[PDB]
């Protein structure tokens, strides 16, 4: 089996990407945030506190003939940005881009935090990290990828995120037309439940490459690129007027600037993030101060190769017995 689905930025900044998902019988289509940094598939639903729903499409289990309540199961999750959600659990049929899993745990939200309510374009999350992070209790549940794996032509999925443009998530095959040159594979540690790997270094603009190991996670559910303070300081030092602002919460820069590119290492290979990808626009409507797309990971406790990095590449999430990550330019 294979699947292929288009993923679309939710706004002009690429703050996140939504991908249509069919749930239940007849299908209910919800637009989910595919998240390689978490392992719960949860949805706005008919059970969600009414006051906490503002424009999202909801899943209504009672209208699905294949929905079954998973008796006694509950879930509760908190994300790195402080958002949270929780509820109960159904099993149902879930299809992504033609690929169908029967008996998928669909986690139904009874409660969601304000950030989710406030984002009318995201109907839920579909987690694609390792199933060990799944929060369902008392019986932990598998991810959509985990459930699909055995049926797939190849035990892989790929992320091809667009810059201010649609992209693609594929399951079960590698589209050799979707990237240039070759794919460079690198080792993964599953020890923290993430697609965790080690970049071989970085460069700023046309500067010389600095060889140095940067341990981080490939996380499609995080907007920005979070790296050690040393690295981030070296990048923003090349932008006149850029500074770290505690009041804004990160590096800002004059909106009149031309940003340099940022290169990161995958083994011997290099992925170049164009400078434009690092511009996230005025800090507030009408401001001439713009928010940077590369920020310090200090105080996160982990480095995050978020969408800013990943959208510069074709990324293979290889779920073989020994998982690996592959990166290609595109």
Active site residue 35: yes
Degrees to nearest 5, angle at CA 193 with 59 and 270: 105
**Comma-separated ranges of CATH 2.40.70.10 domains in the chain:** 5-174, 175-330
The CA R_g of the chain, rounded to the nearest whole Å, is 20
Active site residue 88: no
**For residue 147, what is the DSSP state?**
H
Q: Which of 64, 108, 131, 199 is catalytic?
A: 199
Q: Give the DSSP letter string of 184-208.
A: EEEE-B-TTSS-EEEEEEEEETTSP
Resolution (A): 1.7
**Experimental technique used?**
X-ray
Question: Rounded to whole angstroms, how far apart are CA atoms 253 and 240?
Answer: 8
CATH topology of domain 175-330: Cathepsin D, subunit A; domain 1 (2.40.70)
Q: Which of 14, 35, 88, 219 is catalytic?
A: 35
Superfamily of domain 5-174: Acid Proteases (2.40.70.10)
Q: Give the DSSP letter string of 43-102.
A: E-BTTS-GGG-SS---B-GGG-TT-EEEEEEEEEEE-TTS-EEEEEEEEEEEEETTEEEE
Nearest to 194 by CA among 303, 314, 84, 308: 303
């Amino acid at each position: 089996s294979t699947g292929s689905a288009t993923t679309t930025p939710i706004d002009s900044l690429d703050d996140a990407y939504i991908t249509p998902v069919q749930i239940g019988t007849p299908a209910q289509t919800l637009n989910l945030d595919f998240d390689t940094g978490s392992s719960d598939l949860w949805v706005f639903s008919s059970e969600t506190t009414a006051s906490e729903v503002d424009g999202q499409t909801i899943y209504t289990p009672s209208k699905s003939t294949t929905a079954k309540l998973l008796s006694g199961a509950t879930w509760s999750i908190s994300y790195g940005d402080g958002s949270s959600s929780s509820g109960d659990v159904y099993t149902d049929t879930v299809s992504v881009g033609g690929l169908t899993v029967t008996g998928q745990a669909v986690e139904s939200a009874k409660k969601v935090s304000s950030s989710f309510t406030e984002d009318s374009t995201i109907d839920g999350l579909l987690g694609l990290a390792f199933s060990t992070l799944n929060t369902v209790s008392p019986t932990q549940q598998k991810t959509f990828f985990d459930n699909a794996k055995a049926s797939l032509d190849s035990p892989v999925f790929t992320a091809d995120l667009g810059y201010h443009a649609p992209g693609t998530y594929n399951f079960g095959f590698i589209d050799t037309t979707a990237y240039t040159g070759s794919i460079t594979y690198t080792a993964v540690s599953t020890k923290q439940g993430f697609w965790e790997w080690t970049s071989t270094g970085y460069a700023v603009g046309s500067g010389t490459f600095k060889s140095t190991s940067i341990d981080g996670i490939a996380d499609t559910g995080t907007t920005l690129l979070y790296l050690p303070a040393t690295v981030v300081s070296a990048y923003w030092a090349q932008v006149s007027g850029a500074k770290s602002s505690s009041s804004v919460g990160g590096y800002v820069f004059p909106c009149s600037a031309t940003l340099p590119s940022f290169t990161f290492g995958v083994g011997s290979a290099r992925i170049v993030i164009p400078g434009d990808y690092i511009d996230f626009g005025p800090i507030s409507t009408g401001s001439s101060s713009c928010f940077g797309g590369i920020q310090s990971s200090a105080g996160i406790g982990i480095n995050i190769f978020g969408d800013v990095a990943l959208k510069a590449a074709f990324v293979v999430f290889n779920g073989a017995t020994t998982p690996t990550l592959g990166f290609a330019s595109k």
